[PDB]
């Protein structure tokens, strides 16, 4: 047997498939649509992970992978998040957090990444039971083994890009729809 409610759940009540693709949507419709990429700052192409401003858009299917190959993703598991179909100028589909004067930001990279650079996310079910809504934690380095005390949120640059970045308040609250 298996511990009850011990795995990530999608919008339809079915357990999240380890390695499967999902649209990451905000629980609150008015907040926007799914996940996309955009070219910001001095990037030569789309390397910034962002949230679509279109509430109707489900955005890109996002692959969610745990460290080990189990069927489902146990609650509290460190995970990697990547685009099933990444922008062509990215060298890998996996998201990664990079420092910037505007605070840590979720980006893609034009080179291959070491796994301590991608296994840095962790979902955390939002306390207002059910509905299966999750906050997204970013996990930095304690020294050796990991501390997840930072939440991913949105930052609208003045070009209207709703960038995913580690923020102080208003963390994301996502529902995962099977893609």
Which CATH top level class fits?
A: Mainly Beta
The SS-based structural class is mainly beta
* Overall geometric form: globular
Order of helices and strands: EEEEEEEEEEEE
Give the beta-strand count.
12
Protein name: Chymotrypsin inhibitor 3
Function: Inhibits alpha-chymotrypsin at the molar ratio of 1:2 in state of 1:1.
Site (Reactive bond for chymotrypsin): 69-70
GO molecular function: serine-type endopeptidase inhibitor activity
Question: Can you put this structure into words, describing what you see?
Answer:
Keywords: Disulfide bond, Protease inhibitor, Serine protease inhibitor, Signal. The structure is a monomer. The chain has a 6-stranded antiparallel β-sheet with strand order 2-3-11-10-9-8, with no helix packed on it. It has one domain: Trefoil (Acidic Fibroblast Growth Factor, subunit A), CATH 2.80.10. The chain starts with 20 loop residues before the first strand and ends with a strand. It is built from no helices and 12 strands. It is mainly beta.
Blueprint of the fold:
Layout (H helix, E strand, L loop, with lengths): L20 E6 L8 E4 L9 E4 L10 E5 L12 E5 L12 E3 L6 E3 L13 E5 L8 E7 L6 E10 L5 E5 L7 E5 L1
Antiparallel strand pairs: 1-4, 1-12, 2-3, 3-11, 4-5, 6-7, 8-9, 9-10, 10-11
Would you summarize the structure shown here?
The chain is mainly β. The protein has one domain (1-179): Trefoil (Acidic Fibroblast Growth Factor, subunit A).
